[PDB]
């Protein structure tokens, strides 16, 4: 009869008012906020500039560490290519904080060891200096667990738009001829507010949710939400979500410049990228990167593209222990607001070429260690800071670094063994018109009143002592000397000593100072000693350490700006004295092995050794750095090492794994190269030892020609 048409309204309006409601949180959710993004993890922005000295070999290592890669002839961003004497690269389009940048075209032109020439192929115009973008190391935990990478609608190549389009091809806005399933279009609705699991509460409720959609929304846009939606893995217990963070998880590279064989298989595993988890059944996963390639037009080949697909080997938690730094430094330097906020792109200081050169140094250094030693377990730290700015290079925490739960680096406190012997020296040198370099200091039998019962008799590690019955300033620290170590300190006072500790930067609720504190009582976490030598390297001014440059929100507001923080501690005629000391060390004294190996790197090194070496140690100070390399045992067993010589040939390793900087020690003001004789007093010209006097003036050169 009737009634179709008094229920047809009365099943009419029911659609809509629940249809205008469902209208209302589609909207309402996808205008402001739309998701809780991570912060992105970025590490150094280098910025190159004429006169830079970085080979040829350096740059190139440093654009692979930084995602470009080695072409015949280029074609898009994150490519370079190489000639004899020059570069020719892509520098890939980067969000900079001074200034948004977008893709450019350069030619670095090298002569001999310098960057000579920086040029853009556009005007054929020279740079004075030409940035280069972050690698994006990681990305904070979610606290939603979802982690994301958000590009706009621009930021995807017309390809991965087209093959992503030919498998669920856009229809008109409603749904249509696609439904010839014989017993669907956008689905964006489906995974953003619709749950599980089967229909038919679900396709019922998706398909009108979707016409809503498309309707009263962008048949464009629909496209940026969707290809940041779209699940792709895992890394634990946080989802891999959107084409933008796959391109990186995968294959790293930005997703603009995904070859369309690897951008096709993006496109595939969106039915299931838990059974196509690329690395977890590969065979399968590389069929379902075919049956999108092979498809109809595009049009030539389907064979050229067919043979393999690398996507390289995972990542969980990358660089567990820099990131703890950070971690920690983000807390400090904000607070809390600041895990409840969406977008944030944190700027490291993290330096991927010198990770990489210690991680090798150390994954390779160690167990190539405990074989001539044999030694049924061996570990290590390493921490490489920026001899001026202290910021935070590298950092190692363990002989398994992409594997940390423990972190050596920061967690794991240590003697500190003759590693202490500088703070001595440094303190005497501070004078200097009492301590020289050429200062007399007694090599006899000491035994000190011990408060306590005992009576302390150090002795060397020969337990000899010079027939003389003394020894120069300069050879008891280049050979790193205990009796005359001890009697210095000690005539220079514990008190003293032990401020220049404090200055140097190091945890104040450390200094005990009994006597032992001298020849190395004195327990510091290598992120700690790595501050110390820094106050020294930096010619005695103590930049606290950091890993942090900057924290920017989803805008561009700066959150938190760095800024040089150094301070005066020590002189710079003391300090330089130390380090041309030390630069013995590395060549006449105890590092001798290196001195040998890296003769024209002059660096500038203290060697670190424990009773029965428990702990080794070294601390090296190239042109540009700070490397503090530690190498004992987890439960402090002797290590059966040959003293300092652990720790040196990791480091060793490390120098080789990458290319340093050399050691060119340019002195203070009052900085004299004077000659002594062989009684070592000073002579006006001649004289058979040269060594660096702080004076304003040599009538000390005549005082010392008399008396």
């Given at each position: 009869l009737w009634?179709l048409?008094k229920?047809?309204?009365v099943?009419?309006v029911?659609?809509?008012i629940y249809?205008?409601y469902?209208d209302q949180?589609?909207?309402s959710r996808?205008?402001?906020?739309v998701?809780?993004?991570?912060?992105?993890?970025?590490?150094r922005?280098?910025?190159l500039?004429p006169?830079?000295?970085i080979?040829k070999?350096?740059m190139?290592?440093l654009?692979?560490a930084?995602?470009?890669?080695?072409?015949?002839?280029?074609?898009?961003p994150?490519?370079?290519?190489?000639?004899?004497?020059?570069?020719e690269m892509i520098?890939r389009?980067?969000?900079?904080?001074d200034?948004?940048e977008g893709?450019?075209?350069?030619?670095?032109?090298?002569?001999?060891?310098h960057?000579?020439?920086?040029?853009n192929?556009?005007?054929?115009?020279?740079?004075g200096?030409?940035?280069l973008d972050?690698?994006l190391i990681?990305?904070?935990?979610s606290?939603?667990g979802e982690?994301?990478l958000?590009v706009?609608?621009?930021?995807?190549?017309?390809?991965?738009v087209?093959?992503?389009?030919?498998?669920?091809?856009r229809?008109?806005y409603?749904?249509?001829?696609?439904?010839?399933?014989?017993?669907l279009?956008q689905?964006?609705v489906?995974?953003?507010?619709?749950s599980?699991?089967?229909?038919?509460?679900?396709?019922?409720?998706?398909?009108?949710?979707?016409?809503?959609?498309?309707?009263?929304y962008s048949?464009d846009?629909?496209?940026?939400?969707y290809?940041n939606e779209?699940?792709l893995?895992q890394?634990?217990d946080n989802e891999?979500?959107?084409f933008?963070?796959?391109?990186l998880?995968?294959f790293?590279?930005?997703?603009?410049?995904?070859?369309?064989?690897?951008?096709?298989?993006?496109v595939?595993?969106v039915?299931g990228?838990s059974i196509?988890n690329?690395?977890?059944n590969?065979k399968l996963?590389?069929?379902?990167?075919?049956?999108?390639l092979?498809?109809?037009?595009?049009?030539?080949?389907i064979?050229?593209?067919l043979?393999?697909?690398?996507?390289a080997?995972?990542?969980?938690?990358?660089q567990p222990?820099?990131?703890?730094?950070?971690r920690?430094?983000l807390?400090?330097?904000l607070g809390?607001?600041?895990?409840?906020?969406?977008?944030?792109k944190?700027f490291?200081?993290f330096d991927?070429?010198?990770q990489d050169?210690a991680?090798?140094?150390?994954?390779?250094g160690?167990p190539?260690?405990?074989?001539?030693?044999?030694?049924?377990?061996?570990?290590?730290?390493?921490?490489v800071?920026?001899?001026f700015?202290?910021?935070?290079?590298?950092?190692?925490?363990?002989?398994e670094?992409?594997?940390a739960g423990?972190?050596?680096?920061?967690q794991?406190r240590?003697?500190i063994?003759?590693l202490?012997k500088?703070?001595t020296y440094?303190?005497?040198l501070?004078q200097?018109?009492?301590y020289?370099?050429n200062t007399?200091?007694?090599?006899?039998?000491?035994?000190?009143?011990?408060p306590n019962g005992?009576?302390?008799?150090?002795?060397?590690?020969?337990?000899?002592?010079?027939e003389?019955?003394?020894?120069?300033?300069?050879?008891?620290?280049?050979?790193?000397?205990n009796?005359?170590?001890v009697?210095?300190?000690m005539?220079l006072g514990?008190?003293?000593?032990?401020?220049?500790?404090?200055?140097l930067?190091?945890?104040?609720?450390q200094l005990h100072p009994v006597?032992?504190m001298?020849?190395?009582?004195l327990?510091?976490?290598?992120?700690?000693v790595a501050q110390?030598?820094?106050?020294?390297?930096?010619?005695?001014?103590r930049a606290?350490?950091?890993?942090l440059?900057?924290?920017?929100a989803?805008?561009?507001?700066?959150?938190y700006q760095?800024?040089?923080?150094?301070e005066?501690?020590?002189?710079?005629?003391?300090?330089?004295?130390?380090?041309?000391?030390?630069?013995?060390?590395?060549?006449?004294?105890?590092?001798?092995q290196?001195?040998?190996?890296?003769?024209?790197?002059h660096?500038?090194?203290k060697?670190?050794?424990?009773?029965?070496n428990?702990?080794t140690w070294?601390?090296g100070?190239?042109?540009?750095?700070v490397t503090?390399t530690?190498?004992?045992?987890?439960?402090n067993?002797?290590t059966?090492?040959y003293g300092?010589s652990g720790?040196?040939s990791?480091?060793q390793?490390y120098?080789?794994?990458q290319t340093?900087?050399?050691?060119?020690?340019?002195p203070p003001?009052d900085?004299?190269?004077?000659g002594?004789?062989?009684?070592?007093?000073?002579?006006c010209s001649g004289?058979?030892?040269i060594?660096?006097?702080?004076?304003?003036?040599?009538q000390?050169?005549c005082q010392?020609?008399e008396m």
């Amino acid at each position: 009869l009737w009634l179709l048409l008094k229920l047809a309204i009365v099943f009419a309006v029911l659609i809509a008012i629940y249809g205008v409601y469902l209208d209302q949180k589609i909207r309402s959710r996808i205008d402001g906020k739309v998701w809780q993004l991570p912060a992105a993890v970025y590490g150094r922005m280098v910025n190159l500039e004429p006169d830079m000295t970085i080979s040829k070999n350096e740059m190139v290592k440093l654009l692979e560490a930084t995602q470009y890669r080695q072409v015949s002839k280029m074609t898009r961003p994150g490519e370079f290519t190489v000639q004899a004497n020059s570069i020719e690269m892509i520098r890939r389009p980067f969000d900079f904080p001074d200034s948004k940048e977008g893709q450019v075209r350069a030619r670095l032109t090298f002569d001999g060891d310098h960057l000579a020439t920086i040029v853009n192929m556009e005007n054929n115009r020279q740079f004075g200096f030409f940035r280069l973008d972050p690698r994006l190391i990681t990305m904070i935990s979610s606290p939603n667990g979802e982690q994301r990478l958000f590009v706009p609608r621009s930021g995807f190549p017309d390809l991965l738009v087209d093959t992503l389009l030919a498998t669920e091809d856009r229809h008109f806005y409603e749904h249509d001829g696609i439904s010839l399933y014989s017993i669907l279009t956008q689905q964006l609705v489906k995974n953003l507010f619709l749950s599980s699991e089967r229909s038919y509460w679900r396709k019922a409720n998706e398909a009108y949710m979707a016409l809503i959609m498309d309707a009263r929304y962008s048949k464009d846009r629909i496209l940026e939400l969707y290809m940041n939606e779209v699940y792709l893995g895992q890394s634990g217990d946080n989802e891999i979500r959107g084409f933008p963070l796959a391109s990186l998880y995968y294959f790293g590279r930005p997703v603009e410049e995904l070859s369309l064989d690897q951008q096709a298989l993006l496109v595939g595993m969106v039915k299931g990228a838990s059974i196509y988890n690329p690395w977890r059944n590969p065979k399968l996963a590389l069929e379902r990167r075919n049956l999108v390639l092979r498809l109809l037009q595009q049009q030539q080949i389907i064979d050229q593209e067919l043979y393999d697909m690398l996507s390289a080997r995972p990542v969980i938690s990358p660089q567990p222990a820099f990131m703890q730094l950070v971690r920690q430094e983000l807390q400090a330097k904000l607070g809390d607001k600041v895990k409840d906020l969406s977008g944030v792109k944190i700027f490291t200081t993290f330096d991927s070429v010198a990770q990489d050169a210690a991680e090798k140094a150390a994954v390779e250094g160690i167990p190539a260690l405990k074989k001539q030693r044999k030694l049924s377990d061996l570990e290590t730290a390493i921490v490489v800071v920026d001899r001026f700015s202290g910021e935070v290079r590298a950092m190692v925490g363990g002989s398994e670094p992409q594997f940390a739960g423990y972190n050596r680096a920061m967690q794991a406190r240590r003697s500190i063994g003759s590693l202490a012997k500088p703070a001595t020296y440094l303190t005497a040198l501070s004078q200097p018109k009492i301590y020289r370099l050429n200062t007399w200091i007694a090599d006899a039998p000491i035994a000190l009143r011990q408060p306590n019962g005992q009576v302390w008799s150090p002795q060397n590690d020969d337990r000899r002592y010079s027939e003389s019955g003394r020894v120069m300033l300069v050879d008891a620290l280049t050979r790193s000397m205990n009796v005359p170590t001890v009697n210095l300190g000690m005539a220079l006072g514990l008190p003293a000593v032990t401020e220049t500790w404090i200055k140097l930067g190091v945890p104040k609720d450390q200094l005990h100072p009994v006597p032992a504190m001298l020849l190395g009582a004195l327990n510091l976490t290598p992120i700690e000693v790595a501050q110390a030598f820094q106050t020294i390297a930096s010619g005695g001014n103590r930049a606290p350490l950091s890993a942090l440059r900057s924290v920017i929100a989803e805008d561009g507001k700066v959150l938190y700006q760095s800024f040089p923080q150094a301070e005066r501690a020590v002189p710079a005629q003391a300090a330089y004295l130390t380090l041309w000391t030390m630069q013995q060390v590395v060549q006449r004294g105890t590092g001798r092995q290196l001195g040998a190996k890296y003769p024209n790197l002059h660096l500038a090194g203290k060697t670190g050794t424990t009773n029965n070496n428990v702990d080794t140690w070294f601390a090296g100070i190239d042109g540009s750095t700070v490397t503090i390399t530690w190498v004992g045992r987890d439960n402090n067993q002797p290590t059966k090492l040959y003293g300092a010589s652990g720790a040196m040939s990791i480091y060793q390793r490390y120098l080789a794994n990458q290319t340093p900087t050399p050691l060119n020690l340019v002195p203070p003001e009052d900085i004299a190269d004077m000659g002594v004789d062989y009684d070592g007093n000073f002579v006006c010209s001649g004289g058979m030892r040269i060594l660096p006097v702080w004076t304003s003036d040599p009538q000390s050169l005549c005082q010392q020609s008399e008396m």
